[PDB]
Structure formats: structure tokens, C-alpha cells
């Protein structure tokens, strides 16, 4: 297949306190030119899977209309929300039904967020078939960065939703996760574009990289001929870092989002820069290297902006006297466990969904150190709902640039221990039921998921 121009998703300015219908439905998309692929899409204002824009402090009034053919619910991945507005599997609605999310205030920092379905056992299916979209929150820090660099969505502020998928001869998607290894696609897509290219100018570009794959992690570099080009991590799932972090590669797992700045003024006109995936070395399942995307520096520019010294304030969590919660990732006869338990171990069908089984319980305002201990042969990108966290320590090596800042998904390599810090402070007048689960969608679907509770 010839190189294809990178698709840039549409955008939707989500109004403040005004109800918006988000409809999941079956349709046909032309991913490969000349072929119709049956896929699911979120429809918002006659746009398919648009980039949703939010302003920090606004009211978020969403109704999920489910025409997907099965139970479903939208999860606002990374949001601090009341849990009945968060998209918990208990609240999934049947086909033809609507879930009205109670109003809540956007209180998260500016950055790149993620909306996708969260139904029990079918999240891998629905995400893979097309229910996935990016959210961009804006605050005053994003305003100053946008001015410093003259950023503009679709111009030099570019989403890169990276996904791997497999197509049959007729252009239909093939979803055959092998056992408990997660799904691994044969074809790499960016914003549902196979083998993509994008023309760039000699300017600074911001790329919001979102791993929307079911299981595949990426180790991404920018190759300019022989050498690896430099670039800067500026943000993670929970928003901007304190300062830019210069790197020459980033590791991004499913559920992670990495915001980077790339200064194509490093390159000459007519250069081609390959966004390349190297072996991820996190021990169907594939560890190969391959090009993700090609950038063509086609035009010169008078761009004279500088990468700023400071991006935002990331306040470190005070961990003195914090409670420790050890979360051991095991496997029980080809079934991955969390502290010896799966979702099917009392969590799946609560007698009272307002007071279900929880793995552990905390009081509002508790600082907790969570200690993931991976005793399995596979990596797990572990995600908690309700709060962002700060990565304290990895037993296998130093923190990586992508480990900094406010995170909500941390890579836990085979036989690795990772310590994170969570300030579980929420402004709600009711107790909260939040998920803790692996973000390899098949793992999550086959039960690597529990509740935890934070009281009022």
C-alpha cells in the first residue's frame, strides 16, 4: 500500500454545562482505500471519534447513547470524576439504552486524555473495532505554552493515536486474541491511517501520542538517516511536566499518553524523518521493529520560537507516614491475578453496586504508596481510576522521562516492582468506587480488574 496522508481527526468544543449526545454505532470506514471496513464509532455532532476539547473548570454534561449492539459504557480515562460519572462497568447500558452521566466539573490539568468503552469482558472488542477517541483539556498553562510556540490543533499540535490492527483480504478487521497474551496487530495505524506520512515545516511540532492498542507497547524514536533525532517529553497522562525532558526515545504502553515537542528545524528541507518502533524488550505476541510513520520536511519556515524552560508546577506528593498497599500481579493457571483475585472473584455482580467488594479501602485525603509486584512473565500497564499518581521508584532501573509527572498508567515489566504515590483526595460528598486494572485490554477483559474504595 502506498504511503497515505495522515488523517487528522475532527475536533469538538464540548460546551459548558450543555448536554451532548455521544452515540456508539456501527458503520463502514474506508481505512484502506477502496475497501469498506465494518467498525464502531462514537458519533458527536456528526463527527466520528472527534478530538473532544475541554476547558478546566467547565461543567461536563454527557449522555451516552448506545447503538453498538451490546452492553457498553464510555470511560473518561484519566478524569477525576464522581464514579457514577466515570464509566464503571456496573453502569453499562444495553443496546438501545442511554446512560446520562451526572454533571461534574472538569478538575484535571491540561493535557491529553482518552475516552473509550469500559464494558465487562468486551472492552478489548469495542476499542479494537473503533470506539476510541482523544480528549484535550486546556488550562492557563496550556495557554502560555500555546502562545510561546504558536501551537494550533491540526497545524503543529498533532494527535498521534497509534494502534495496531489486522485486516483480512476484504478489508474487514480480524480480532483473534490468542489465549491470555493480548491482541497484537499486523498493521500499524496512526489516527486510523495505514502507512502514514505527514509533511512538516522547519518548526516545532507538538505530538500528542496516545497508545490506543489493545496490548502492544511501543518504543518510539525519530530516525534522521543514521542518527536518532532529539525531542522533548513535555507531558504525560496527567498533564504537563515541570520542565521539558530531552530524550531520543520514549516507551509508551496502552493507556499511556506522551506529549512531545519535535524541533524539525534540526532537519534540512527534503529530509525524511522516520518515526520508528524499536524492540520494546518488555520480555501472537511480537517484539519486532518497524516504522510507524514518516515525516517529510518539505518547507522552510521563519519559525523562531524557543522551547520554554518551565511548563507547569508538578507538586511532589508528601509520602511521610503514608499507608502502603502492596498489589501483587500473579497468574493462576493461565489467568492473571491481582492479590490472588480476579474480577470474577466477587466483584462482577455485587448485591449492591453502591457497596460492592473492594480490594482495599481508604479515607478521603489518604496518601497511599501502591507497590506493584509483577511475579508474572508478562508486562502489565497498570491503571487506576479516580486519581493521578507520581512514580516513586522502579526496581529494575531509573525512572524514565515518561515515568515523570502526574501519571495514571505505569508500565510494570516482568519480575519488576514499581512504587507509586497516590493522594486520594476528592471533593465529593459520597464514597467513591474506582477501578484498578491492567490496561492490556484482553487482561482487563479476562478479569485483571478490581474495585477499590475511597470514602467521603
The DSSP line for 208-256 is EEEE--SS--EEEEEEETTEEPPEEEEEETTEEEEEEEEES-EEE-TT-
Per the CB < 8 A criterion, the answer to whether 392 and 368 are in contact is no
Residue 84 binds which entry of Cu ion, ligand [O], none, CB below 5-8 Å type-dependent: none
C-alpha cell, 226: 543514521
How many angstroms separate the CA atoms of 73 and 98, rounded?
9
**Residue closer to ligand [O], measured from CB, 205 or 434:** 434
257 binds ligand [O] (CB under 6 A): no
CB of 123 to ligand [O], least distance (A): 7
**Residue closer to ligand [O], measured from CB, 198 or 384:** 384
Residue position matching grid coordinates 507538538: 206
* Binding to ligand [O], residues 365-394 (CB under 6 A): 383
**Residue closer to ligand [O], measured from CB, 383 or 453:** 383
**Would you say 180 is a known binding-site residue?**
no
Per the CB < 8 A criterion, the answer to whether 342 and 330 are in contact is no
Residue 443 binds which entry of Cu ion, ligand [O], none, CB below 5-8 Å type-dependent: Cu ion
The DSSP line for 72-105 is B-EEEET----GGGTT-GGG-B-TT-EEEPPPEE
Task: Map residues 422-451 to x or -, x wherever contact with ligand [O] holds by CB under 6 A.
Answer: -----------------x------------
Three-state secondary structure call for residue 128: helix
Which residue minimizes CB distance to Cu ion? 438
CB of 439 to ligand [O], least distance (A): 6
* Binding to ligand [O], residues 109-138 (CB under 6 A): 118
**Residue closer to ligand [O], measured from CB, 204 or 450:** 450
**Would you say 88 is a known binding-site residue?**
no
**Residue closer to Cu ion, measured from CB, 247 or 376:** 376
**Would you say 280 is a known binding-site residue?**
no
> For residue 161, which of 3, 10, 384, 386 has the smallest C-alpha distance?
10
**Would you say 75 is a known binding-site residue?**
yes
Residue 120 binds which entry of ligand [O], Cu ion, none, CB below 5-8 Å type-dependent: none
Residues that contact ligand [O], how many (by CB under 6 A): 5
C-alpha cell, 287: 517484539
CB of 381 to ligand [O], least distance (A): 10
C-alpha cell, 209: 501520542
Q: What does the DSSP 8-state code read for residue 269? A: T
> For residue 275, which of 293, 290, 289, 262 has the smallest C-alpha distance?
293
**Would you say 444 is a known binding-site residue?**
no
**Residue closer to ligand [O], measured from CB, 348 or 367:** 348
C-alpha cell, 62: 454527557
CB of 358 to Cu ion, least distance (A): 16
**Residue closer to ligand [O], measured from CB, 44 or 74:** 74
CB of 129 to ligand [O], least distance (A): 16
- Helix (H) or strand (E) holding 205, with range, is strand 204-211
**Would you say 385 is a known binding-site residue?**
yes
Q: How many CB atoms lie within 10 A of CB 167?
A: 17
77 binds ligand [O] (CB under 6 A): yes
Residue 380 binds which entry of Cu ion, ligand [O], none, CB below 5-8 Å type-dependent: Cu ion
How many angstroms separate the CA atoms of 390 and 369, rounded?
10
How many angstroms separate the CA atoms of 94 and 96, rounded?
6
**Residue closer to Cu ion, measured from CB, 261 or 382:** 382
Residue 208 binds which entry of Cu ion, ligand [O], none, CB below 5-8 Å type-dependent: none
How many angstroms separate the CA atoms of 118 and 141, rounded?
30
Q: Binding residues for Cu ion, per CB under 5 A? A: 77, 255, 380, 438, 440, 443
How many angstroms separate the CA atoms of 450 and 453, rounded?
10
Please say whether the dihedral angle defined by the alpha carbons of residues 125, 187, 24 and 253, taken in this order, is positive or negative.
positive
C-alpha cell, 416: 519488576
CB of 170 to ligand [O], least distance (A): 31
Per the CB < 8 A criterion, the answer to whether 295 and 307 are in contact is no
CB of 448 to Cu ion, least distance (A): 5
User: HSE on the CB side for 387, CA within 13 Å?
Assistant: 25
Which residue minimizes CB distance to ligand [O]? 77
75 binds ligand [O] (CB under 6 A): yes
Per the CB < 8 A criterion, the answer to whether 190 and 196 are in contact is yes
CA angle 57, 370, 327 (to 5 degrees): 125
**Would you say 116 is a known binding-site residue?**
yes
**Residue closer to Cu ion, measured from CB, 77 or 245:** 77
CB of 348 to ligand [O], least distance (A): 17
CB of 206 to Cu ion, least distance (A): 22
Which residues form the interface with ligand [O] (CB under 6 A)?
75, 77, 118, 383, 439
Annotated binding site: 75, 77, 116, 118, 380, 383, 385, 437-439, 443
Instruction: Provide the annotated binding site for Cu(2+).
Output: 75, 77, 116, 118, 380, 383, 385, 437-439, 443
Amino acid at each position: 500500500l502506498s504511503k497515505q496522508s495522515l488523517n487528522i481527526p475532527g475536533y469538538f468544543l464540548f460546551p459548558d454545562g450543555q448536554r451532548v449526545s455521544i452515540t456508539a454505532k456501527w458503520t463502514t470506514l474506508e481505512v484502506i482505500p477502496g475497501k469498506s471496513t465494518d467498525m464502531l464509532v462514537y458519533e458527536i455532532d456528526n463527527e466520528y471519534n472527534p478530538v473532544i476539547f475541554l476547558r478546566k473548570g467547565q461543567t461536563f454534561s454527557a449522555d451516552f447513547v448506545n447503538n453498538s449492539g451490546e452492553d457498553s459504557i464510555i470511560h473518561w480515562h484519566g478524569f477525576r470524576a464522581p464514579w457514577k460519572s466515570d464509566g464503571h462497568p456496573y453502569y453499562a447500558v444495553k443496546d438501545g439504552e442511554t446512560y446520562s452521566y451526572p454533571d461534574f466539573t472538569i478538575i484535571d490539568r491540561s493535557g491529553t486524555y482518552f475516552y473509550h468503552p469500559h464494558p465487562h469482558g468486551r472492552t478489548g472488542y469495542q476499542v479494537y473495532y473503533g470506539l476510541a477517541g482523544m480528549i484535550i483539556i486546556e488550562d492557563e498553562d496550556e495557554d502560555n505554552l500555546k502562545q510561546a510556540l504558536d501551537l494550533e490543533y491540526g497545524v503543529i499540535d498533532i494527535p498521534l493515536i497509534i494502534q495496531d490492527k489486522t485486516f483480512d483480504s476484504s478489508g474487514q478487521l480480524v480480532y483473534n486474541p490468542m489465549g491470555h497474551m493480548g491482541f497484537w496487530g499486523d498493521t500499524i495505524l496512526v489516527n486510523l491511517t495505514p502507512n502514514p506520512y505527514m509533511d512538516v515545516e522547519r518548526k516545532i511540532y507538538r505530538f500528542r501520542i496516545l497508545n490506543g492498542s489493545n496490548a502492544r507497547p511501543y518504543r518510539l524514536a525519530l530516525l534522521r538517516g543514521n542518527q536518532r533525532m532529539r525531542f522533548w517529553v513535555i507531558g504525560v497522562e496527567g498533564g504537563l511536566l515541570d520542565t521539558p525532558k530531552e530524550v531520543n526515545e520514549i516507551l509508551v504502553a496502552p493507556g499511556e499518553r506522551i506529549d512531545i515537542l519535535v524541533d524539525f528545524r534540526d532537519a534540512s528541507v527534503n529530509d525524511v524523518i522516520k518515526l520508528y518502533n524499536f524492540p520494546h524488550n518488555l520480555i501472537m505476541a511480537d517484539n519486532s521493529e518497524f516504522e510507524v510513520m514518516e515525516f517529510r520536511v518539505t518547507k522552510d519556515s521563519a519559525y523562531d520560537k524557543s522551547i520554554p524552560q518551565r511548563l507547569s508546577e508538578v507538586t511532589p506528593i508528601n509520602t511521610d507516614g503514608a499507608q502502603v498497599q502492596r498489589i501483587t500481579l500473579g497468574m493462576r493457571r493461565m489467568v492473571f491475578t491481582i492479590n490472588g483475585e480476579t474480577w470474577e472473584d466477587g466483584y462482577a455482580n455485587p448485591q449492591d453496586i453502591n457497596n460492592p467488594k473492594v480490594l482495599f479501602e481508604q479515607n478521603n485525603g489518604d496518601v497511599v504508596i501502591i507497590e506493584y509486584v509483577n511475579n508474572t512473565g508478562m508486562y502489565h500497564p497498570m491503571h487506576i481510576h479516580g486519581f493521578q499518581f507520581q512514580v516513586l521508584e522502579r526496581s529494575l532501573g531509573p525512572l524514565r522521562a515518561t515515568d515523570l509527572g502526574w501519571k495514571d498508567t505505569v508500565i510494570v515489566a516482568p519480575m519488576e516492582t514499581v512504587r507509586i504515590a497516590v493522594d486520594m483526595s476528592h471533593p465529593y460528598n459520597e464514597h467513591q468506587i474506582y477501578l484498578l486494572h491492567c490496561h492490556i485490554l484482553e487482561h482487563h477483559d479476562e478479569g485483571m480488574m478490581v474495585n477499590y474504595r475511597v470514602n467521603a
